[PDB]
Structure formats: C-alpha cells, structure tokens
Amino acid sequence: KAKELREKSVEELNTELLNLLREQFNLRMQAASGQLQQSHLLKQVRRDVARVKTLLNEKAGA
Amino acid sequence: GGLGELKRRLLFVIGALIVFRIGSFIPIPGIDAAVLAKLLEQQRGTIIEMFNMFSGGALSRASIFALGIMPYISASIIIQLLTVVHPTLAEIKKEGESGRRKISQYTRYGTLVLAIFQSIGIATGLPNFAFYFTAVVSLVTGTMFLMWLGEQITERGIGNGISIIIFAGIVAGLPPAIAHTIEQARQGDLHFLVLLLVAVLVFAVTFFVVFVERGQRRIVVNYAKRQQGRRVYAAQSTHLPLKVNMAGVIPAIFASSIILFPATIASWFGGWNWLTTISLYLQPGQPLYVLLYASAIIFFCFFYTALVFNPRETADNLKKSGAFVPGIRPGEQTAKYIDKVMTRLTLVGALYITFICLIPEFMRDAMKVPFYFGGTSLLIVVVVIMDFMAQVQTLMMSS
Amino acid sequence: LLTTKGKATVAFAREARTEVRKVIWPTRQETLHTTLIVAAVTAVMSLILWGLDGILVRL
Amino acid sequence: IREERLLKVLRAPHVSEKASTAMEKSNTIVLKVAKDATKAEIKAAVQKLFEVEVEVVNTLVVKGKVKRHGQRIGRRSDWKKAYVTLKEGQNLDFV
RNA sequence: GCUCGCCGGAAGACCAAGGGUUCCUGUCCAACGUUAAUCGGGGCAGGGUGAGUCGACCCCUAAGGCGAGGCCGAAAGGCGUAGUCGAUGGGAAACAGGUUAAUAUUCCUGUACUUGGUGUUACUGCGAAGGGGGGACGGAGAAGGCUAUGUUGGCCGGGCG
Ligand SMILES: [Mg+2]
Ligand SMILES: [Mg+2]
Ligand SMILES: [Mg+2]
Ligand SMILES: [Mg+2]
Ligand SMILES: [Mg+2]
Ligand SMILES: [Mg+2]
Ligand SMILES: [Mg+2]
Ligand SMILES: [Mg+2]
Ligand SMILES: [Mg+2]
Ligand SMILES: [Mg+2]
Ligand SMILES: [Mg+2]
Ligand SMILES: [Mg+2]
Ligand SMILES: [Mg+2]
Ligand SMILES: [Mg+2]
Ligand SMILES: [Mg+2]
Ligand SMILES: [Mg+2]
Ligand SMILES: [Mg+2]
Ligand SMILES: [Mg+2]
Ligand SMILES: [Mg+2]
Ligand SMILES: [Mg+2]
Numbered sequence: 001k002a003k004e005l006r007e008k009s010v011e012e013l014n015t016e017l018l019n020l021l022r023e024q025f026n027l028r029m030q031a032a033s034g035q036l037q038q039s040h041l042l043k044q045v046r047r048d049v050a051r052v053k054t055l056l057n058e059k060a061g062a
Numbered sequence: 063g064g065l066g067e068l069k070r071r072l073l074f075v076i077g078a079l080i081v082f083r084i085g086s087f088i089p090i091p092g093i094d095a096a097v098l099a100k101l102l103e104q105q106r107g108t109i110i111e112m113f114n115m116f117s118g119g120a121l122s123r124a125s126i127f128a129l130g131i132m133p134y135i136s137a138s139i140i141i142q143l144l145t146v147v148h149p150t151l152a153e154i155k156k157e158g159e160s161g162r163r164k165i166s167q168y169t170r171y172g173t174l175v176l177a178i179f180q181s182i183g184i185a186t187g188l189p190n191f192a193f194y195f196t197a198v199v200s201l202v203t204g205t206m207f208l209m210w211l212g213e214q215i216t217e218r219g220i221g222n223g224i225s226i227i228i229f230a231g232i233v234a235g236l237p238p239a240i241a242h243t244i245e246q247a248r249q250g251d252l253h254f255l256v257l258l259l260v261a262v263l264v265f266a267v268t269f270f271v272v273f274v275e276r277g278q279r280r281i282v283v284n285y286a287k288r289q290q291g292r293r294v295y296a297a298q299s300t301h302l303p304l305k306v307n308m309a310g311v312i313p314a315i316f317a318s319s320i321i322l323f324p325a326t327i328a329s330w331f332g333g334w335n336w337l338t339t340i341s342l343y344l345q346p347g348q349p350l351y352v353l354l355y356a357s358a359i360i361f362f363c364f365f366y367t368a369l370v371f372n373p374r375e376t377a378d379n380l381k382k383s384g385a386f387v388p389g390i391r392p393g394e395q396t397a398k399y400i401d402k403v404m405t406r407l408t409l410v411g412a413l414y415i416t417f418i419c420l421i422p423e424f425m426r427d428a429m430k431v432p433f434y435f436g437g438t439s440l441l442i443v444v445v446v447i448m449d450f451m452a453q454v455q456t457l458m459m460s461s
Numbered sequence: 462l463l464t465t466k467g468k469a470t471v472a473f474a475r476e477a478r479t480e481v482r483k484v485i486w487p488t489r490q491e492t493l494h495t496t497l498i499v500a501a502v503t504a505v506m507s508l509i510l511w512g513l514d515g516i517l518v519r520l
Numbered sequence: 521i522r523e524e525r526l527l528k529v530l531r532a533p534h535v536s537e538k539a540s541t542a543m544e545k546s547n548t549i550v551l552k553v554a555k556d557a558t559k560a561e562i563k564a565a566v567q568k569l570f571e572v573e574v575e576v577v578n579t580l581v582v583k584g585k586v587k588r589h590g591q592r593i594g595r596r597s598d599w600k601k602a603y604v605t606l607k608e609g610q611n612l613d614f615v
Numbered sequence: 616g617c618u619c620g621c622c623g624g625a626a627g628a629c630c631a632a633g634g635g636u637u638c639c640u641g642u643c644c645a646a647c648g649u650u651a652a653u654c655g656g657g658g659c660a661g662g663g664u665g666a667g668u669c670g671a672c673c674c675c676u677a678a679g680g681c682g683a684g685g686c687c688g689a690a691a692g693g694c695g696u697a698g699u700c701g702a703u704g705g706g707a708a709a710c711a712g713g714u715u716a717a718u719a720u721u722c723c724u725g726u727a728c729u730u731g732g733u734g735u736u737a738c739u740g741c742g743a744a745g746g747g748g749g750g751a752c753g754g755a756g757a758a759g760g761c762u763a764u765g766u767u768g769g770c771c772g773g774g775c776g
Contacts, residue, residue: 021527025569029615032532032552034282035483233506237514265500272495277485286660290645384642386661389536391716392641399540406476413477447502475611482614536662538715545714546723578665578721585636588659603665603722 002051010059013052020049063454065461068220075219078211079230085204086118086125091196098124101189107329109345111433113322115232122235126204129326131212131227133180133205135319137173139362141165170209177205180326187331221453228315229446232439239434256431264435267418268444274414275448279304279407281400283385300385304404307411311449313366314415314442317359321438346423346436356416363412364405373401415441526565529557533614534601548605549612555581555600562602572610578603 008016024045030036063069089095102123104110114122117130145151145165154161178198185197208227216223246252280301287296324344328337344351377396386392390399422437433439534550542548553562559577567574584596606612 018523021524025527025530026615028532029530033614034280234510234514237510238518241515241518265496268499268503269492269495272499273488273492274484276491276495277488279480279483284660288659381641384660386641388661389534389539391537391662395537395640395716403480406473406480409473410477410480446506447499451498451502479612479614538663538717541715542722548722580665580718582664583636601665605722 001048002055005051005055010056013056013059017049017052017056020045020052024049068457068461071218071220075215075226075230078215078219079226079234082118082208082211082227082231083234085127085207086120087123088126088200088204089124090126090128090200091193094193095124109325109433112436112438113325115235115434115439116228116318116322118231119235126200127208128184128201128204129177129180129322130231131205131208131224132319132322133177134170134173134209134212134224135316136323137169137176139316139320141169141172170213173209174202174206177202183327183330187333221449222311225311225315225449228318229311229442229449232442233446236434256429260431260435264440267440268447271418271444272448274306279306279403281387281403283380284388285383285385287384302400304407305411306407307363307415308367308370308404308408310363310411310415311445313359313362313412314445316366317355317362318438318442320358320362321355347427352420352423355419359416359419360409360412363415364408367404367408371404373397373404376400418444521561521564523568526561526568529554529561529565530569531599542603543612546605547608547610547612548603551602551604553579553600553602555598557600557602559602562604566604570613570615572613573607575605575607577605 005013005016024042027036027042027045031039031042063072089098102121110121113129114120116132117125117127119125120128120130141151145155151165155165157164178201181198181201182194184201185194189197212223212227214223215221215226220226243252243257247254247257278301280303283300283302285296285298285300287298288294289296321344325341328334328341328344331337344354346352346355374394374397377393377400380386380396381392387396387399390396418441419437422435422440426432426436530551530553532552534552536550539550542550549566551562551566553565557565559579562577562579563574566572579600579602581598581600584598586593586595588594
C-alpha cells in the first residue's frame with residue numbers, strides 16, 4: 001500500500017483512519033473472546049493505521 | 063474402508079440391509095401378491111407412502127415388516143418412560159452391564175409383543191381371521207428377523223444398528239420417484255424451474271446444516287503443564303468443540319416413531335371418529351400437527367441429548383487431566399457452566415431441526431407441487447450423510 | 462403459570478441470541494468445502510442405489 | 521468526546537464466575553478497559569459502540585501479580601476493570 | 616463428629632500504620648515447615664478489591680520548610696519579606712436489611728440526604744484579597760436529666776424427659 005493512500009485527499013484519509021480504527025476495535029474484541037483464529041490481522045491493521053497517520057502529518061507538514 | 067476390519071463390517075451391513083430389502087417384498091398372507099399389489103397403489107390414503115420408507119417398501123409392496131423397526135422404537139421410548147416414573151426400573155437401569163442389557167431385553171420383549179399388537183390393530187381394523195392370522199404371523203416373523211438383523215449391525219457391522227436400519231430403509235426407497243422425474247426431464251412435462259429450485263434447496267439446506275456444523279461453539283480450555291523430566295515445557299489452549307446437535311441421529315427416528323404411533327393406532331380403524339379426529343389432526347398439512355410435532359421433537363432431542371453427556375463426568379475428567387475453563391471454578395461450577403451452555407445450544411439445534419421439518423410443507427401448500435421432500439426425509443438423509451462422514455473421519459484418524 | 466412460561470421462554474430466547482453471538486458468520490471457502498463434500502457423498506450413495514436398483518427394476 | 525478516543529478505551533470483555541453472575545442477576549457487563557479511561561469515557565464508549573443505554577459505571581484498578589517464567593521474575597501490568605450497568609429494558613449484544 | 620481442656624479488658628470483634636497478594640478456589644509435596652504431612656502464610660494455575668455521602672485528593676491554617684525581589688557572605692551558601700507548602704487540628708451529605716468460595720456504609724432491596732450546574736416561577740440590591748460576628752478552644756470537681764446495655768416480670772414458640 002502507501003502509494004494508494006498518497007493518492008487520496010485529506011478528508012478521505014480521515015475517513016480511512018476511522019474505518020481502520022473500527023476494524024482494530026472489532027478485531028481485538030474478537031481476540032479477547034477467543035473467537036479470532038487469525039491473529040496476524042492485528043499487526044496488519046495496527047501498522048496500516050500508522051501509515052495513514054504518517055501521511056496525514058506529511059500532508060499538513062507540506 | 064481399505065482395511066479389511068471395517069470392510070467386512072460394511073459388507074455385513076450391506077448384506078443385512080439387502081436381506082432387509084429381500085424381506086421387504088414378501089406377501090403378508092400365503093400368496094396375496096397381486097391383490098396386495100393392487101391395494102398398495104393406495105385406493106385410500108396417499109400419506110401411507112411415508113409408512114413405506116421406514117419399512118423398506120412394505121406399505122409400498124407386500125412385506126413381512128410393515129412398519130419396519132418402528133415398533134421397537136415405540137417400545138424403546140415406553141420403557142424409557144417407565145424407567146423414570148417407576149423406581150424399580152430406575153434401579154435396574156443404573157445397574158451397569160447386565161442391568162442395562164436386561165432393560166434392553168425387556169425393551170426387545172416389549173417390542174415383539176407390540177408388533178403382535180399392531181398386527182392385531184391392522185388386521186382387525188384396516189384390511190378386512192385367516193388373513194388376520196397370516197398378517198400377525200408374517201408381521202412378527204418380520205419384526206423379529208429385523209430386530210435381530212439390527213442388533214447384528216451394532217456388533218459385527220458398522221456404527222449403530224437401528225440407526226442404519228431406518229437410515230438405509232428410507233435411503234433405499236428413493237430411486238423410482240426420481241427415475242420418473244428424470245424420464246420426464248427429457249420431455250418437460252413438469253417444469254424444470256420448480257424441480258431445480260427444489261434441487262438447489264435440498265443442497266443449500268444440507269449445506270446450511272453442515273455450515274452450522276462447520277463453525278462450532280468452542281469453549282476455550284487451558285492446560286498448564288511442565289513435566290518433571292525438565293524436558294516438556296507446555297502452556298496449551300484446547301477448544302472443547304460443542305456441536306449444535308449432539309448425535310442427532312437417534313432422536314430423529316424416535317420422534318418419527320412417535321409421529322407414526324398415533325397414525326398407526328388411529329388411522330387403521332377409521333370407525334373411531336375421535337381417532338380419525340387426531341389422525342386427521344396429525345396429517346402434516348395442518349399447523350396443529352406441527353405444534354404437537356414441535357413439542358415432540360424438542361422433548362425427544364432435549365431428553366436424549368441430556369441422556370448422552372454427563373457434564374459432571376466431563377468436568378471431573380477435565381479436572382483430572384489438569385485442565386480448567388479460565389475464570390470458572392473447577393468441579394461443580396464447570397459442570398453447571400458446560401451443562402447450561404450445552405442446553406442453550408441443543409435447544410437451538412432442535413429448533414432449527416423442527417424448522418427444516420415444518421417449512422417444506424408450507425412451501426408445498428403455497429406452491430403447486432405436492433413425501434420424501436416433505437421435511438422429515440430430507441433431514442434424516444442429511445443425518446445419514448453427517449453420521450457416515452463423522453464415523454468415517456473418526457476411524458480415518460485411527461487409520 | 463402461562464406468564465411465567467412466557468418469561469421463561471423469553472429467558473431461553475435470550476440464551477438463544479447469546480449462543481447466536483458465538484455463531485460463525487458467512488464464509489464462502491468453508492461453503493465450497495461443505496458443498497463439495499456432501500455433493501460427493503450423496504453422489505456415492507446415489508450411484509450405489511442406481512447401480513443396484515436400475516438393473517434390478519430393468520429385470 | 522471524540523470517537524477516535526472512544527475506540528481505544530475498551531480493551532476486552534471479561535469472563536469469570538462473578539462476571540456471569542453479574543450479567544444474569546443485575547443486568548451488568550464487566551469490561552477490561554484502558555488504564556486512563558474514566559467513568560465518563562467508558563459510559564460514552566459502551567453507549568456508542570454496543571448501541572445500548574447505560575445506567576451507571578463503577579470502576580476499580582487491579583494490581584498485577586508477580587510471576588516467574590523460567591526463573592525470570594516479571595511483574596504483570598495493572599488494569600482497570602469496569603462494571604457497567606445497563607438500563608433494565610436494554611438487551612445484551614456482543615460485537 | 617463427639618467428648619475433654621485454655622483465653623475471654625483477650626489467646627475476642629474492628630480500624631489507622633507497616634507490609635503488598637500473604638486473601639479465595641483448584642491442584643502439587645522435591646525444597647521450605649526444627650518431626651510426619653494427604654495440611655500450609657510453601658510450589659503452580661485461575662479468580663477476587665465496584666462509593667456524590669467511608670478515607671485520600673480538595674478548601675483552611677500550627678509547628679516548621681521553601682522563598683520573587685531583599686539583606687549578608689571567598690565561592691558554595693546563610694537568613695528572611697510578599698508569598699507558597701505543611702495535619703497530628705478546622706471544613707457539605709447514608710442508614711437498616713439481603714447477598715459472594717473471596718468485596719461491600721461501595722453491589723442489590725427499601726427509605727433518605729448534600730453541594731454544585733441549568734431551566735421555570737414569584738420576590739428582590741447585588742458585589743472583596745477589605746470591615747464586624749462566628750468558627751474558638753484550659754484543669755479539676757460535682758449532680759441533675761438521659762440513652763447504650765443488662766436483670767426480673769408479661770407475652771410467644773417449644774419441652775414433661
Ligand atoms: Mg452506584
Ligand atoms: Mg473507586
Ligand atoms: Mg510492566
Ligand atoms: Mg483478667
Ligand atoms: Mg506467593
Ligand atoms: Mg488460605
Ligand atoms: Mg513422603
Ligand atoms: Mg518435612
Ligand atoms: Mg500459597
Ligand atoms: Mg466525608
Ligand atoms: Mg510560614
Ligand atoms: Mg533571590
Ligand atoms: Mg528561607
Ligand atoms: Mg495551603
Ligand atoms: Mg487529618
Ligand atoms: Mg477532615
Ligand atoms: Mg473478609
Ligand atoms: Mg472575619
Ligand atoms: Mg472550664
Ligand atoms: Mg432503655
């Protein structure tokens with residue numbers, strides 16, 4: 001990713017961040033209940049979020 | 063199956079249900095063959111076709127076991143009631159091997175005389191004392207042969223004997239009706255849209271059953287074990303895989319025997335207007351029948367599953383092996399927990415089962431198309447596939 | 462007695478939903494697994510019954 | 521309160537005998553929530569995400585035990601347990 | 616479990632402190648326990664601490680500390696003003712009953728109270744870092760009125776050994 005995200009506007013990016021955070025919440029919610037078989041997803045979302053943030057900053061920084 | 067051990071069990075079962083299908087063609091009096099072959103074309107009462115599924119085509123054509131092994135199950139429940147209310151049988155039932163098998167021999171000996179009584183009921187009310195006598199004789203000879211034949215499949219054959227008797231009895235009644243449908247399929251007499259809608263619905267309903275079986279309800283259990291040999295270092299998470307229905311094989315057949323019992327007692331007379339009141343009540347075109355039927359299915363599934371597991375034995379086992387359900391007290395509280403939870407599951411199971419039973423009839427009342435697809439036989443067949451594929455995998459883990 | 466049976470069935474329906482929340486949602490891969498497994502077993506039993514009763518009814 | 525903050529507040533639903541007893545008897549759920557979450561934030565989060573109406577929120581902070589993995593002595597992390605009481609008409613969703 | 620013996624202004628019930636999981640359940644018996652241990656304040660694993668009214672925080676100060684500028688001192692620093700901290704003291708409000716293996720004035724049942732914010736309605740001169748009252752204070756003694764509490768009697772359940 002991260003090229004695809006750089007082609008998105010700032011508003012779209014915020015919406016994206018919200019979506020990602022909701023996936024994160026749901027995911028760790030399933031994981032705590034022992035209902036999540038694929039753990040790797042966590043690290044995937046948690047990182048994706050970072051990416052988004054690093055973009056937001058760089059767009060407001062330049 | 064490539065192992066001769068299970069292969070000879072299966073070739074015993076195949077042969078057993080082959081002499082089931084050999085005895086399914088033998089006329090009730092000495093030779094009534096053509097006369098009966100005329101009377102089994104149902105000059106009255108089409109629903110009797112259901113009565114030919116469990117008997118292997120006895121009410122379809124001229125046999126020695128007319129209801130099949132359905133009398134036995136009607137005994138298997140009766141004693142099971144008498145075991146509860148009467149303490150003297152409740153003592154023999156808890157008595158271990160010879161005590162439980164003496165109750166099973168009293169169930170077999172109540173069974174054979176129940177086949178005598180139902181042959182009395184038919185050959186008194188419906189068909190007609192020489193015919194009555196040959197009826198009772200051929201019917202008890204057949205029910206005895208089949209009872210023996212189904213206690214032989216439990217031992218030297220595959221799985222449960224009675225289960226496979228009824229299952230293959232309905233399984234072996236199908237091919238002519240679909241042979242006619244696929245003969246009319248190169249013509250187009252009955253339109254392919256409705257028949258392929260039902261062809262996709264049988265398959266998608268079976269698929270939903272087995273998808274609800276795919277994703278389980280798993281109770282996460284934990285083991286903390288480090289062996290004193292200084293070698294094994296173990297923190298282990300093991301799921302206890304609870305299924306929506308616990309061996310849903312037998313309570314299906316049981317519930318079917320309890321459907322067909324008032325249909326045997328009430329409908330063979332017809333000179334009794336109360337009997338015919340309840341046997342017309344119990345015809346599956348009515349919501350009333352489905353109410354009484356629902357209560358039957360839920361009671362027999364709950365009772366039977368509650369019989370099978372002993373949540374105290376399971377919990378004590380879990381405690382013995384050094385396992386715990388995290389957050390719940392080992393011993394009695396694990397019992398109460400797994401028991402309440404298993405209840406909450408099996409209730410949902412018997413519910414979706416009563417729905418797979420009820421829905422096809424409202425679908426057949428709304429639609430133009432009017433027994434194998436009525437919801438009882440669909441379900442029992444889904445259960446043949448499930449049962450055989452669970453028993454194949456259990457011994458595929460072994461092999 | 463009927464209102465307590467009502468409230469009891471409402472509690473058992475709360476239990477129902479509680480066990481619905483642990484129910485696994487749609488998956489197409491396990492869908493095709495189930496689909497092809499049961500299609501195969503049904504085809505086997507059907508080929509047995511046909512190989513037998515086709516030649517039996519024919520005779 | 522911003523919806524970004526809410527989402528990070530609820531860690532996990534808690535299972536136990538006492539939790540069970542609570543849920544059945546008092547119509548109360550027990551959550552493991554952020555160490556810095558407040559009764560306000562928790563109320564907000566549960567009313568937002570699970571779409572249920574909350575009556576009141578009680579909280580406590582559990583101190584971590586001291587455990588040994590292969591002779592190494594660690595000290596587990598403190599965490600905030602929140603008892604949440606739903607209004608009586610409300611029904612319990614798990615998502 | 617039944618007898619026997621000991622403490623009972625303590626060898627009892629409950630707080631502050633100091634400790635910090637020793638609490639509760641399961642399981643284990645190498646080490647630890649001045650012996651044995653199937654037991655433990657020991658090993659291992661899971662639980663458990665719910666507050667508008669209890670305490671701290673907070674508002675207010677005592678001793679005393681720190682201290683803008685300031686004075687003083689080779690340097691470090693010392694003292695101290697305005698100030699600002701400091702309880703062992705002053706300052707709003709909750710009780711009885713039920714409940715857990717383990718919390719409860721915290722949960723629940725019932726019946727209350729306090730202080731703020733906002734709105735309605737009626738009435739109305741409001742306003743401080745300033746002024747005045749209060750808060751606000753010792754020792755001993757006495758005896759008048761009481762309750763906590765206990766004893767007898769009445770009542771109620773049970774007992775004729
Ligand atoms: Mg409260
Ligand atoms: Mg608190
Ligand atoms: Mg840490
Ligand atoms: Mg003394
Ligand atoms: Mg310790
Ligand atoms: Mg202890
Ligand atoms: Mg020893
Ligand atoms: Mg020793
Ligand atoms: Mg210990
Ligand atoms: Mg106070
Ligand atoms: Mg001072
Ligand atoms: Mg200075
Ligand atoms: Mg100074
Ligand atoms: Mg001060
Ligand atoms: Mg003080
Ligand atoms: Mg005070
Ligand atoms: Mg205590
Ligand atoms: Mg003054
Ligand atoms: Mg004085
Ligand atoms: Mg008094």
